[model samples]
Target chain A: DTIRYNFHPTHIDTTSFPFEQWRKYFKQTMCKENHRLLLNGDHQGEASFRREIAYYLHHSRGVNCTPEQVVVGAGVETLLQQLFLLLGESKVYGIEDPGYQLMRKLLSHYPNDYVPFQVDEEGIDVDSIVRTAVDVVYTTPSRHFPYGSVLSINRRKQLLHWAEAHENRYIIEDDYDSEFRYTGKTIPSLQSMDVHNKVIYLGAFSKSLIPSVRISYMVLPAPLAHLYKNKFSYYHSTVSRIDQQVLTAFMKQGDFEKHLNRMRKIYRRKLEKVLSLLKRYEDKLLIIGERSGLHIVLVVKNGMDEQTLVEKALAAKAKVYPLSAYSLERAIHPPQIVLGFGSIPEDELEEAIATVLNAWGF
Target chain B: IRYNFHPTHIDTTSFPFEQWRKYFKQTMCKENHRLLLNGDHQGEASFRREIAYYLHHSRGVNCTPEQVVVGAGVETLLQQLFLLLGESKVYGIEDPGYQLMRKLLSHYPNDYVPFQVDEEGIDVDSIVRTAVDVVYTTPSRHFPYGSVLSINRRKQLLHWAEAHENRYIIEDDYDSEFRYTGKTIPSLQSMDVHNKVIYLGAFSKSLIPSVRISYMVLPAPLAHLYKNKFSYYHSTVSRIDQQVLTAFMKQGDFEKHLNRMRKIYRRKLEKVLSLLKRYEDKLLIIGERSGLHIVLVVKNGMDEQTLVEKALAAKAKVYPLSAYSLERAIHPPQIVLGFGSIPEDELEEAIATVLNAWGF
Candidate 1:
């Protein structure tokens, strides 16, 4: 059986990737200038990337930083690696337990030590963070991945206060996929609240745009920014300058804003369809993470095992991912599955839910 | 006084970057159709196919596209290789080697020991004597040292890797494309039937470094291991960049560009030789068989610092060879002069500046 709607987390809508606008811009304006700028591109990516990145980040996420603070790399992985280098002599770090799996893998390779911290409905446990000896904490405070719990304002204050208490304690705020929030209010990033220069903001175009472009950036605080300049200046920018310019031009001309707005509506509609359809399985399929992002987690009350559920879904031609795959710790209460609507068409989402229910033996 | 002959090592004058601009422009024009896809973690399959074909036909490299792992740069590729091989307990590196490789190796958890090179190879005896699980060597003319590992030593190195159960040799074929003489020896990996040698090559020198495209051809077993372990990892290099390279090779422009670059570099080298041969008494001119730059050993036994200072006074910049040295050793004062980036018209003037600095 062919899996028509893949709910894999990494799935993206490359079909709507802007081709004509990009070609027209590159061909007409930036090609020659971009070609000339390749030699010293390592010195810093095209100025436009630094300039444009600050704008979107400021307006949408409430991130407090200038263009100079934004350091662009090929991906967030590379940027995170750079961050670790800047921090220097990491003793121990904390990551959300039911977090992004790749984040755990990457942090494990950090020469130092990494431990998993638990996250409840209000997001990462602040009390646990206070108790631990973790020098660095990587959190997706805006909206947690897989779990989709927004960090509460009260806990956000507590997390900020904790960072301020210690001279060394730092926060790596992975505000990944925070744009498509279908909720009452947008949660201002922890970085915006940080006056102590504790939060490092990491953002990526992989979710906002096509993943192939491979552009992600981080906004460092004033102190780290200066340190990165004086100390880690030897390191070159990993992103292609031409790609940077194109992205910058895309943003400058307001295409980026337009694209984001369109994507939000499209995704919100799709999420609604999936959620509405999943209503039929309300007894068996308990939905979580429906407020934001492309994916939602389902705590299955059905008698079937998690593996059996996934295998059955696969058999019925509907791809499903085990939520345990994202978590470093053991699986929580009920068996869970991740359903991402990023690739699935709204029309097919209903059918997908039906297929998923049938596969689950409901 | 301004340095008339500035051997700024990173300058890649011979590489016609204009060809890339044209290719990239055309590529972006068909962005929606040409690019817009691929699944292989290694790279775009067609790009790897092109690279495989190019390597086999040009450098006598032995491997299919399946064996090739395309990455953003040497650092990126090496990082992936480290992850693939697991934490190597101990590593062997070349002394007076490529500085960047050494710097990168130091970052990992591995305990690395630098072994100096003699003319034969990377002091294989010393490398074998060490408790190293992996040995990294630039077999195709050692960086700055400029000694191609002899066929016998190459075999010996392979044998050493084969002797152990979990040991491997990394052959960094960095400047292999620019050999000026001899029936260019096939890459060290090609000679190894034991599947112990891993081949790494980058387009930085051949093309522009800013392009940031590099590839490593791993042995079949290692390749399988990498695929199994890192299949989930995304390809770092842009698909657009990969597609541009693929089209460039398909159109035969890559071959033409390479041939042009070779001629340009070789001509510049010949000019340098014609001018510098006069100072053969004061300086022993070494390393010309491979590419771009040549090393000069001071016959008068002058200290490297003084020589550099004198060249500075004469408005000719020269880099001291000791900077690349790993272990402290007293050797002849050697200076490196790079002519690859120098324009042909300026070659004579550049050499004259060097001669003037040497008290001609």
Candidate 2:
């Protein structure tokens, strides 16, 4: 018999989406029904969405930008695609080595040289970046995806200096899961510290809200914003008017903050139980990426390989995702496994760990 | 004194969007909440089925629901189409075509020959001589010039596509809905048994532009290939928008909307013809039989730039037909007045203002 359990590290509270509040807003107060949805909206985005995003980013993440710099699109992928087209022809682009795989897959379609470099406790290695002729580099500085290392203040400035050195060099900062930091002060964004306008900040409602909504934005430098208006004005906005309007009304009315606060509390509570149990494996498993977001990576130094570790966990009815799957330049270090507790109920944490131990014969 | 009036040639008010709001509101129910927000990769199946049915009955277009690919707008669909037909190296576009079409196609940096448009439509001989893999033509009504491709040339163009294994035609039936004078001409796709043509149409011109919805009917083979290749790509349109549009069509309100708009446009055209009687001595009017626009070639020595500027000063906006020419030409200047967006009650005043402005 197989162990029956469910978990999601990506962390989406799909059931909690406030559709009733949204429906009431649409029916009673919103003017979307009377308003005409422009085929191509204003070059940057709607004034309401941009205004709210700028306000949210300023107070929460310390991202210094105005509504004028924000260019909203359907999602991160769509906005990134627009960014590439606006940057014109580029030669080489750098990404974190064990970075998000979808970025690598998407970049394949563009005719640019993709170089994957290494990351350490401070996030992207600056020396490796300066060694190569990378015109643009993507960094998840606030919270690195699978590795879970928040970039140090010193390194954030170093990356900004590297960008300012070259005429067209840029640091494309992806602030995906920056919303859920369990401990310490909310670290400032890479864009906030850069005086040279080298950082292009990307924000996603997909991570904060639900992925299905498909809304995200990019904040370019003043120079790039002018260029976008001149060159790419004809390109239509991909997001639907209704979706944009609904989300706009939601944010403008202060409902977004309430939802974000609720999700953080729920995530932190569930993660506490899982973290307490994970402490037992510290002797055998080196735990990384904890005290932060929804997932924690346990580097298995117990002489068991990645596949065997995953299979053993599965056999024991615990589903642990392999860390190497996210690696673009494959890691040769000790095998690690990632466990997501955001969606897993608090009561099930002990049972999940016990199941894994039973299968491993620990 | 300047006439205080502006006109939009793009007819966007055929359907009463207000009447359709109730239909959309009903679809936003509790049961449909998941589906309305699911972010389907290939548009909602229900909308495509309705489109296939509408196209079949109205334009005699032969297509199944599987053949339709719903996109956010015509440009989006065109980009997807260009990617799907990847091997195509060269395209022969109709010269003096819709300017936006040429702009979008030119982005790929593909070799394009702007074949000239003549009495029968885009010169089919120039297309054959160019020997391009694809030829884009508005066979229903050549935009700006407003010449419907004759049946004889339609036969020739279809024959050209069928002659080679690599050949295909893009039928941009942009305004096939409003045939003012005669029985409707069967679409090039309807005539096509070989599955060699791709049909592009948008409700923006016929219905409304604000929705940003447009569709394309690909042949079976290409449709199958698209599903295989782009199944991973998310559909650009929201299911909520699609559901509303589908409900509008399903309730039989769409056909009634089109018919009422057609009758109104006919009356406007008749009034426009009579008003032009006062200026026949100084002008030769062309392109009145098919649809929304009229071309006026001024016999006076004043050039197009001066007349258009004068009209603008008088608070009128009139388009210069020759301005649409991508390649420079020396043809005598002509002006195009499109009354699609203007109310019929204001037509006489709009015409009177143009006449008085032309007096200068």
Candidate 3:
């Protein structure tokens, strides 16, 4: 099957998981000789399940994190349900103005979300956050959507200080794209940087790892951890056992690192080709993002909604992400477009963007 | 950004992936996150099956699988103890007893008293008042003394439990399998001429601490009530863990394992008791009856703090029951030594060495 040149290829080293290993383990342990059918939830869903853990292995290891805190959610959207139960109502979540709409929509599910003003280059305004008595704020610091700008150290410090001063207040650090920082080191994580114990880190494997992994985690204060434990005690709950084993094994194997390295090298090449092609006809565009992540934003002149421009790109078979998709309580950012280049390479990128330019009447 | 590739990320050294893989490839382990979608309200099914076999074989409890309601651990069980019991007018606990029940009663608008335990078991006559709703006893015996509940005491307690009609006796059977002797001393459940005893059991002491699984055997009448209340919360164990446990028990793996553990422990106990020459005359080695733990009363001047300090100094971690009692019961405070943890060779040396550390 031929993947579309207009779409970025999902980076997966191995197509399907090693079911042979799983089958062998199954043959030996639960399935050995015993012909009785098992409840898939118990047998397949347990923390002992190997494949589930395999999904979390690289992400946990790559980020320098504790595996115990790793949570395997059904999906990012599904997490809103669980988060509601844990967080309760009257909680406000910060929304990146030019961010993913899904993030904003998910926050409003059970918990009340107040839109926190985000910035273009300087990152989320801290002074604005200080004014509100909001309990929790969600932020995409590593790379802001549409236009990527790493949260500055000074802003990071202010946020940390705010959390420390406030009681029972926590920050949900949503690091959506720390994976492909093409320039400097990933600015210190809120969890790592804070001394106040005020941050509840939400990590997802949606981008860094495959979404099918459905792996995510909440690094809570020990008090919260114990609370979650006691509240849910007597509940025979855990991730699939094989998943944990495989993921733990993969992390331990150094194979994840090897894979990440390979991915970075390949993605960088792709990024270079896309930029070079876009550079040929660069008049109305200004590229943003300090060399990080799969996607870079091109800020265009204001007025036209991204959806209108996207129609043209669609006609030319050039799939492009529009700005209006991340509209706040208002209109879209601009005529800007987000070009995700990691999935595309030199061989296919030139034609893909050329088609977009052609559709734009260039 | 450039990854530092620091060991902090995921220390391959710390994670036992290979062993886990080998084990998982053969027998994958499971957790609650998968099957426990409803949230943690009901008890785990694995715990139910485990408790079912445990009650039937070890405690000689005449209980059905439906009668068991699991809780987080004993502490969490205490929170719902009043709710489940319904009639929480007064509860009797072991004097110098487990304080979890006392801690629970503190929050509830109920009454409770410290019952007595002798060389045999609970001294029911002392606190056998008509007002008492339930008598909580270790029932196996006074722990450190290792005393078995005598037949007469069992009859006496059961009679009270029956006489009150509304009253019930809960025999906590955490360390039931660690008995030094094979003789079956009829539990209060066994001696129940009338159905009046509830057996509470947990796997923390026997299994790992992190593995939170506990179960209680309710009387036929209370079983329905418990199920109705517990079903609201999905507190059952992981289906896989439960299934594995069922297979383990049904295959006689549990009995075999218990038998093996007993033999291993008895051998170690013999070795330790043999080395106790200094306090042989003074120390009254009590309830060596059943279970993996014991109570050693330093017959002379040796007491709680001294013994505890010595044990800690000896690099042997053991809890003194004195710390557990809310109000200091009249029973002489002694060191409660749980033998489940100490290594076989180290058992005798550790015991002797720990005792010696106390200037025994």
Candidate 4:
């Protein structure tokens, strides 16, 4: 039997054959300037990646980042897996609780950062971190997982304060989707507050772009920079070269960010529509997290064991993820459905969430 | 607390959706060979070249395309390296080495004998005493202290390799680039009077990280057998990354990247070294003649366990050989510091903060 390795409560948007938009983008990129890195074997590619990345993080939504700090990859999963090789065992790598389920599953292969903590509108529970011995905390600090919460300023400082005490404590600040902050300036990143050396800033293009690009960068500490090259250099190579070059070129120019602003507008509207539909089920659902990124969560009534519900939904082809999927123990999980709205168009958003909610007899 | 963020600037949505779609659509991707090698050196290219450059440039390697083997990463190559070397003897591993190297190789059908490492890198003296045949040593400072294998150690490696029938010193030349110190040491293969040392090189750290292409600089003699043995299973990587990388190197971008990175990285190293130097401990700093890392032998201080705990509480990520060690061998306080990703802006702040947090 081909035990299909599936991410339950499927990411329908990334899956609906994103190649259409991918193909369309390629058509425009056929031009000389756009195709520079793809054809030229240039390490830096064109210059749009840095530009777009910066624009998206700054002028559009704005996060604490620059072109140099941003690296691209073909798949976030592959990057996360290999990062363990470059990074030897540390005390623990902090993960988000009831977050992106795959983050925990994959990061476990490494010796560090296997521990999980809670998330909220203000990001990771900073108080818990202060009390722990973990050196690395891997959080989607920008937007909370399943639940989309942008970490508050106090928490960001709390994280920076902990990181400041020692350089070893790395806050794997994964701004999973700080790109489309609808209201104000993109919340300042843990890296932005990292006056101390404890932040290992990481980012991926899986959500904003397609899962096809898996470039990841660790805004590393001065001490470990060479150590990374030394021990794991062998593991280092062109795992996703052309894409990185292209992204680099993309950042250097300014198209990548423009795309983000455009997408943010599109997603912001779509998210509002999706939220409005789910709001009808407000009496039964707990709509938590931030109003950003491709996905949002609907915390259903407690004792509604999501594993069983998610399994049934996946079988019915609604393709939804459960809160329990992110937790180690399934029994206590609040029945929740995470809907990634950006990948799906405006019309499909209301219908999909309605269908998933309807299936729960909500 | 050496890690900090100082974004120079930020750009918004780039490579117009139309353009990105066009590039992503028409451009090559791994889906073409998803079940296959995913357009990587591991098995993406149908034809190979630039690898031929190893023959002209590398001292220890002298073989044709037929003998050259490409891999996704060194971990993949290490998988093949062990298989090629066979599981006959307990493979000897160097102590205070890249502990994961030992872990990966041991994953093969072989139990390994651990060798002690010193200022001379892997003490060829202690390595030979393992009585086990195959020996894996990184002559360049592949890890901490930027320790290089001394001339005497190199000669000793060649001697042991020649004497033992099954013996071959797997000299991994990791981080030969960005040598902010002495001249690049002649590879163990370069000094080999007898056909003994085997060399491995990876381009991930020096170049862009996504290009998962790594080349093994094989000895001229064994190159034939190694290729013939593994060719059936071996395939090339995405012709694009390899092809582009070859052009990047041949066209001088690769060298330019290297030269620029070296100068940029050296400045970062100085900041870190300066911080460590200011600390008071019975620490003997062993610098690398080549490669990236430098080692500090902690004579008396918090034990590795206690120190690691404190470091982690303060959020400083580091590694100790506590897990890889089978027995308490002569190991020192090994802490490796890197400078590649440590950009100019965050260099001093990250170092000073990390050092201060540790109360160093």
Which of 2 and 3 is ahead in DockQ?
2
lDDT for residue B5 in candidate 1, whole number 0-100:
35
Error of 3 at B111 (Å): 5.7
For model 3, what is the alpha-carbon lDDT of residue B244?
44
Model 1 lDDT tens row, B1-360? 334332323343445545655877666554354254335566777898888888788778888988788887776677767766787467777777777666775556667787877766668787677778887887777777577777877767778877678987777876766775543677776777878878888787666766677888888788888887765567788887787878888888877776666777777777777876776777777664557677777777667788888877655676777767766546677777776555688778777877666766
Could you tell me how far off, in angstroms, the CA of residue B296 lies in candidate 4 after the best superposition?
41
Please give, for residues B106-225, the per-residue lDDT of candidate 3 as tens digits.
434678777655655656667654467777776665544556666766666666656446766678764655555553565667767466777787665443333345667677777787
The digit string of per-residue lDDT tens for model 1 on A1-362 reads 22466776767765676677766666554343333454444445667778877777788878877888778887567666666766677568887778777766775555677888777887778998787788888888777777778788888888888888978788888777677777654777778787878888887887777767887787888888898887665566677656776677788877877888788787777777766666765676677756776777777886656677778886777788887777766645678777776776655565777787777776
Error of 2 at B65 (Å): 4.1
Interface DockQ of candidate 3 = 0.02
RMSD of each: 4.0, 4.3, 13.4, 16.2
Q: Which stretches of candidate 2 lie over 4 Å from their true place?
A: A1-11, A28-43, A183-185, A240-242, A245-248, A269-287, A296-324, A329-362, B1-18, B31-33, B36-38, B64-67, B83-88, B105-107, B180-183, B329-332
lDDT by residue for model 3 (A1-362), tens: 12254443223322223445434443443333321112113311344333434444334423334434444433444344445556556566676676666655554323276765767578877788888767777787666766666688888888888878857677776775654656464665666666556776666545554433444544556556656555443333223343334455455445556656666666666667666667775567878763666667776663565567767666755566656556665554555666655445465555767676667776
Candidate 1 interface RMSD after superposing interface residues: 3.7
Deviation from truth (RMSD, Å), model 4: 16.2
Single out the weakest 10-residue window by summed lDDT for candidate 2 chain B: B1-10
Top-DockQ structure, candidate number: 1
- Lowest lDDT 10-residue stretch of candidate 3 chain A: A35-44
For model 2, name the residue pairs that clash: none
